Short mmCIF file of all heavy atoms in Angstrom, two decimals:
data_model
loop_
_atom_site.label_atom_id
_atom_site.label_comp_id
_atom_site.label_asym_id
_atom_site.label_seq_id
_atom_site.Cartn_x
_atom_site.Cartn_y
_atom_site.Cartn_z
N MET A 1 -33.43 -98.73 181.39
CA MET A 1 -32.64 -97.56 181.53
C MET A 1 -31.08 -97.86 181.52
O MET A 1 -30.24 -97.16 180.95
CB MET A 1 -33.06 -96.84 182.86
CG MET A 1 -32.19 -95.70 183.30
SD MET A 1 -32.47 -94.31 182.24
CE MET A 1 -30.89 -93.55 182.59
N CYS A 2 -30.76 -98.88 182.29
CA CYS A 2 -29.37 -99.26 182.44
C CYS A 2 -28.91 -99.75 181.13
O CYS A 2 -27.75 -99.31 180.62
CB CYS A 2 -29.19 -100.29 183.61
SG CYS A 2 -29.48 -99.55 185.21
N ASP A 3 -29.62 -100.67 180.54
CA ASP A 3 -29.17 -101.27 179.28
C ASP A 3 -29.03 -100.28 178.17
O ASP A 3 -28.11 -100.41 177.33
CB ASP A 3 -30.11 -102.39 178.84
CG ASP A 3 -30.03 -103.63 179.72
OD1 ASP A 3 -29.11 -103.73 180.58
OD2 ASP A 3 -30.88 -104.53 179.58
N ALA A 4 -29.87 -99.27 178.18
CA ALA A 4 -29.91 -98.40 177.01
C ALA A 4 -28.80 -97.31 177.22
O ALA A 4 -28.04 -97.00 176.30
CB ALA A 4 -31.26 -97.77 176.88
N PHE A 5 -28.77 -96.64 178.39
CA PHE A 5 -28.16 -95.34 178.49
C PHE A 5 -26.88 -95.30 179.31
O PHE A 5 -26.09 -94.38 179.13
CB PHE A 5 -29.13 -94.35 179.11
CG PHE A 5 -30.32 -94.05 178.24
CD1 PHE A 5 -31.56 -94.55 178.54
CD2 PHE A 5 -30.21 -93.25 177.11
CE1 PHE A 5 -32.67 -94.28 177.71
CE2 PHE A 5 -31.29 -92.97 176.33
CZ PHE A 5 -32.52 -93.51 176.60
N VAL A 6 -26.66 -96.25 180.23
CA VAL A 6 -25.54 -96.13 181.12
C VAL A 6 -24.25 -96.30 180.37
O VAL A 6 -24.07 -97.18 179.53
CB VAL A 6 -25.69 -97.14 182.24
CG1 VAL A 6 -24.33 -97.37 182.94
CG2 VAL A 6 -26.86 -96.72 183.19
N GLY A 7 -23.32 -95.43 180.70
CA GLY A 7 -22.02 -95.48 180.10
C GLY A 7 -21.40 -94.11 179.91
O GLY A 7 -21.89 -93.14 180.40
N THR A 8 -20.35 -94.09 179.13
CA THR A 8 -19.62 -92.91 178.84
C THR A 8 -19.73 -92.63 177.36
O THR A 8 -19.38 -93.49 176.56
CB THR A 8 -18.11 -93.06 179.30
OG1 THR A 8 -18.00 -93.49 180.67
CG2 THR A 8 -17.32 -91.81 179.08
N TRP A 9 -20.26 -91.46 176.99
CA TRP A 9 -20.56 -91.14 175.65
C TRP A 9 -19.80 -89.84 175.23
O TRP A 9 -19.70 -88.95 176.03
CB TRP A 9 -22.07 -90.86 175.49
CG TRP A 9 -22.94 -92.03 175.92
CD1 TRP A 9 -23.43 -92.28 177.13
CD2 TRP A 9 -23.38 -93.08 175.08
NE1 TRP A 9 -24.18 -93.46 177.15
CE2 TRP A 9 -24.12 -93.96 175.88
CE3 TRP A 9 -23.19 -93.37 173.73
CZ2 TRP A 9 -24.73 -95.10 175.33
CZ3 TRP A 9 -23.81 -94.50 173.20
CH2 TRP A 9 -24.53 -95.36 173.99
N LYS A 10 -19.28 -89.82 174.02
CA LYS A 10 -18.48 -88.67 173.54
C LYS A 10 -19.14 -88.04 172.31
O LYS A 10 -19.56 -88.76 171.43
CB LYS A 10 -17.08 -89.12 173.21
CG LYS A 10 -16.90 -90.14 172.14
CD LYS A 10 -15.46 -90.69 171.99
CE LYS A 10 -15.42 -91.80 170.94
NZ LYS A 10 -15.83 -91.35 169.56
N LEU A 11 -19.23 -86.71 172.26
CA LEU A 11 -19.85 -86.04 171.14
C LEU A 11 -19.06 -86.28 169.90
O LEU A 11 -17.85 -86.02 169.88
CB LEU A 11 -19.94 -84.52 171.40
CG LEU A 11 -20.65 -83.74 170.33
CD1 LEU A 11 -22.13 -83.97 170.27
CD2 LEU A 11 -20.41 -82.24 170.47
N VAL A 12 -19.74 -86.70 168.85
CA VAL A 12 -19.14 -86.86 167.52
C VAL A 12 -19.75 -85.98 166.42
O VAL A 12 -19.07 -85.76 165.44
CB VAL A 12 -19.12 -88.29 167.06
CG1 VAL A 12 -18.31 -89.13 168.01
CG2 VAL A 12 -20.49 -88.89 166.82
N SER A 13 -20.99 -85.49 166.52
CA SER A 13 -21.50 -84.56 165.56
C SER A 13 -22.57 -83.69 166.19
O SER A 13 -23.25 -84.09 167.13
CB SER A 13 -22.12 -85.27 164.33
OG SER A 13 -23.30 -85.95 164.61
N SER A 14 -22.73 -82.48 165.62
CA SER A 14 -23.75 -81.56 166.08
C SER A 14 -24.33 -80.83 164.87
O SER A 14 -23.61 -80.52 163.92
CB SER A 14 -23.07 -80.55 167.04
OG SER A 14 -23.99 -79.67 167.59
N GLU A 15 -25.62 -80.54 164.95
CA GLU A 15 -26.32 -79.72 163.95
C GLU A 15 -27.21 -78.74 164.68
O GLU A 15 -27.95 -79.11 165.59
CB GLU A 15 -27.20 -80.61 163.07
CG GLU A 15 -26.38 -81.42 162.03
CD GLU A 15 -25.50 -80.64 160.86
OE1 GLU A 15 -25.67 -79.37 160.65
OE2 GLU A 15 -24.63 -81.27 160.12
N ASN A 16 -27.17 -77.49 164.22
CA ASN A 16 -28.07 -76.43 164.66
C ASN A 16 -27.89 -76.04 166.12
O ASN A 16 -28.80 -75.36 166.67
CB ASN A 16 -29.57 -76.75 164.38
CG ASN A 16 -29.85 -77.10 163.00
OD1 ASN A 16 -29.37 -76.44 162.13
ND2 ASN A 16 -30.70 -78.14 162.76
N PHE A 17 -26.78 -76.38 166.76
CA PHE A 17 -26.65 -76.08 168.18
C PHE A 17 -26.47 -74.60 168.42
O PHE A 17 -26.98 -74.08 169.42
CB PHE A 17 -25.54 -76.92 168.79
CG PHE A 17 -25.52 -76.86 170.30
CD1 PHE A 17 -26.62 -77.28 171.05
CD2 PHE A 17 -24.38 -76.48 170.99
CE1 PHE A 17 -26.62 -77.29 172.45
CE2 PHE A 17 -24.35 -76.50 172.39
CZ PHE A 17 -25.49 -76.89 173.08
N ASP A 18 -25.74 -73.89 167.56
CA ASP A 18 -25.65 -72.43 167.73
C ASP A 18 -27.03 -71.78 167.71
O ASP A 18 -27.31 -70.93 168.56
CB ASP A 18 -24.68 -71.83 166.71
CG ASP A 18 -24.40 -70.33 167.01
OD1 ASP A 18 -23.77 -70.06 168.02
OD2 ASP A 18 -24.86 -69.50 166.23
N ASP A 19 -27.85 -72.16 166.73
CA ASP A 19 -29.19 -71.59 166.66
C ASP A 19 -30.06 -71.98 167.86
O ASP A 19 -30.81 -71.13 168.34
CB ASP A 19 -29.85 -71.99 165.36
CG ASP A 19 -29.38 -71.07 164.22
OD1 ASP A 19 -28.74 -70.01 164.47
OD2 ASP A 19 -29.55 -71.45 163.11
N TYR A 20 -29.93 -73.20 168.36
CA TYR A 20 -30.66 -73.60 169.56
C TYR A 20 -30.19 -72.74 170.74
O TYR A 20 -31.03 -72.20 171.48
CB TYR A 20 -30.41 -75.09 169.84
CG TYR A 20 -30.90 -75.53 171.19
CD1 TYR A 20 -32.25 -75.77 171.42
CD2 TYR A 20 -30.05 -75.69 172.25
CE1 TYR A 20 -32.73 -76.13 172.69
CE2 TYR A 20 -30.47 -76.06 173.53
CZ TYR A 20 -31.83 -76.28 173.74
OH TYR A 20 -32.26 -76.64 174.99
N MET A 21 -28.87 -72.56 170.90
CA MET A 21 -28.38 -71.76 171.98
C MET A 21 -28.85 -70.31 171.89
O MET A 21 -29.18 -69.67 172.91
CB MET A 21 -26.85 -71.78 172.02
CG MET A 21 -26.28 -73.07 172.56
SD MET A 21 -24.48 -72.93 172.91
CE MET A 21 -23.84 -72.89 171.26
N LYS A 22 -28.92 -69.75 170.67
CA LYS A 22 -29.46 -68.39 170.50
C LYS A 22 -30.86 -68.33 171.01
O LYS A 22 -31.25 -67.37 171.68
CB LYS A 22 -29.46 -67.98 169.03
CG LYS A 22 -28.17 -67.55 168.45
CD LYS A 22 -28.30 -67.10 167.00
CE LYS A 22 -26.98 -66.69 166.42
NZ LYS A 22 -27.09 -66.10 165.11
N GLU A 23 -31.70 -69.32 170.67
CA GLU A 23 -33.08 -69.32 171.09
C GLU A 23 -33.21 -69.42 172.62
O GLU A 23 -34.07 -68.78 173.23
CB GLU A 23 -33.80 -70.45 170.36
CG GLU A 23 -35.23 -70.23 170.10
CD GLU A 23 -35.54 -69.17 168.99
OE1 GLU A 23 -34.64 -68.73 168.23
OE2 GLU A 23 -36.72 -68.93 168.76
N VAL A 24 -32.34 -70.20 173.27
CA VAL A 24 -32.33 -70.32 174.70
C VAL A 24 -31.87 -69.03 175.38
O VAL A 24 -32.25 -68.80 176.50
CB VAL A 24 -31.40 -71.48 175.02
CG1 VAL A 24 -31.14 -71.48 176.48
CG2 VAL A 24 -32.03 -72.81 174.57
N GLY A 25 -31.10 -68.19 174.71
CA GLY A 25 -30.63 -66.92 175.24
C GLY A 25 -29.17 -66.86 175.54
O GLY A 25 -28.72 -65.90 176.18
N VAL A 26 -28.39 -67.82 175.06
CA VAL A 26 -26.93 -67.82 175.36
C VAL A 26 -26.27 -66.70 174.56
O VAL A 26 -26.55 -66.54 173.36
CB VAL A 26 -26.35 -69.19 174.96
CG1 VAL A 26 -24.88 -69.24 175.32
CG2 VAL A 26 -27.09 -70.30 175.64
N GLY A 27 -25.37 -65.94 175.19
CA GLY A 27 -24.70 -64.83 174.55
C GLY A 27 -23.59 -65.29 173.63
O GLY A 27 -23.15 -66.43 173.64
N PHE A 28 -23.11 -64.33 172.83
CA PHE A 28 -22.18 -64.64 171.77
C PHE A 28 -20.94 -65.38 172.26
O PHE A 28 -20.58 -66.44 171.70
CB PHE A 28 -21.75 -63.31 171.03
CG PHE A 28 -20.73 -63.53 169.95
CD1 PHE A 28 -21.10 -63.73 168.64
CD2 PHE A 28 -19.37 -63.49 170.25
CE1 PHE A 28 -20.13 -63.91 167.68
CE2 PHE A 28 -18.41 -63.69 169.27
CZ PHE A 28 -18.81 -63.92 167.99
N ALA A 29 -20.22 -64.85 173.24
CA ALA A 29 -18.92 -65.45 173.60
C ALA A 29 -19.14 -66.85 174.12
O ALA A 29 -18.35 -67.76 173.81
CB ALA A 29 -18.20 -64.59 174.58
N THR A 30 -20.12 -67.06 174.98
CA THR A 30 -20.40 -68.38 175.49
C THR A 30 -20.79 -69.32 174.35
O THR A 30 -20.37 -70.47 174.32
CB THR A 30 -21.51 -68.31 176.55
OG1 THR A 30 -21.03 -67.52 177.63
CG2 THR A 30 -21.85 -69.68 177.11
N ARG A 31 -21.61 -68.87 173.42
CA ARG A 31 -21.97 -69.76 172.27
C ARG A 31 -20.73 -70.16 171.53
O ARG A 31 -20.62 -71.34 171.10
CB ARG A 31 -22.94 -69.12 171.27
CG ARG A 31 -24.31 -68.90 171.81
CD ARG A 31 -25.34 -68.72 170.68
NE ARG A 31 -24.85 -67.83 169.63
CZ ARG A 31 -24.90 -66.51 169.67
NH1 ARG A 31 -25.42 -65.87 170.71
NH2 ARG A 31 -24.39 -65.81 168.66
N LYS A 32 -19.81 -69.25 171.26
CA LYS A 32 -18.64 -69.61 170.42
C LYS A 32 -17.77 -70.60 171.12
O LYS A 32 -17.30 -71.59 170.52
CB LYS A 32 -17.81 -68.36 170.11
CG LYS A 32 -18.50 -67.35 169.31
CD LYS A 32 -18.86 -67.80 167.96
CE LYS A 32 -20.34 -67.97 167.95
NZ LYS A 32 -20.73 -68.14 166.53
N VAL A 33 -17.51 -70.39 172.39
CA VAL A 33 -16.61 -71.32 173.13
C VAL A 33 -17.33 -72.63 173.40
O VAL A 33 -16.74 -73.71 173.24
CB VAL A 33 -16.09 -70.64 174.42
CG1 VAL A 33 -15.30 -71.57 175.28
CG2 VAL A 33 -15.27 -69.41 174.00
N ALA A 34 -18.58 -72.58 173.85
CA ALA A 34 -19.28 -73.82 174.13
C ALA A 34 -19.52 -74.61 172.88
O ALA A 34 -19.48 -75.87 172.91
CB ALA A 34 -20.58 -73.55 174.85
N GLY A 35 -19.77 -73.94 171.77
CA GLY A 35 -20.01 -74.64 170.55
C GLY A 35 -18.77 -75.41 170.03
O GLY A 35 -18.97 -76.39 169.31
#
C-alpha cells in the first residue's frame, strides 16, 4: 500500500467526468465548477 500509493498526486487528465457526475446526480453549476 505504502509503496504503491502514498504521496502527493496532481490531476493531469480527465475523460468522461462530466457524464459520470451527471449519472451520480451532481447538478449543473457544481459540475461546471468542479469539472
Side-chain angles (χ1 to χ4, degrees):
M1 170 72 203
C2 291
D3 290 350
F5 293 107
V6 162
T8 308
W9 302 89
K10 62 188 175 61
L11 184 71
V12 299
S13 69
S14 184
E15 285 298 348
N16 306 315
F17 191 60
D18 189 68
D19 279 348
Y20 169 77
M21 285 191 288
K22 283 183 181 187
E23 209 73 12
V24 169
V26 183
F28 177 93
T30 297
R31 293 199 315 277
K32 296 296 109 169
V33 174

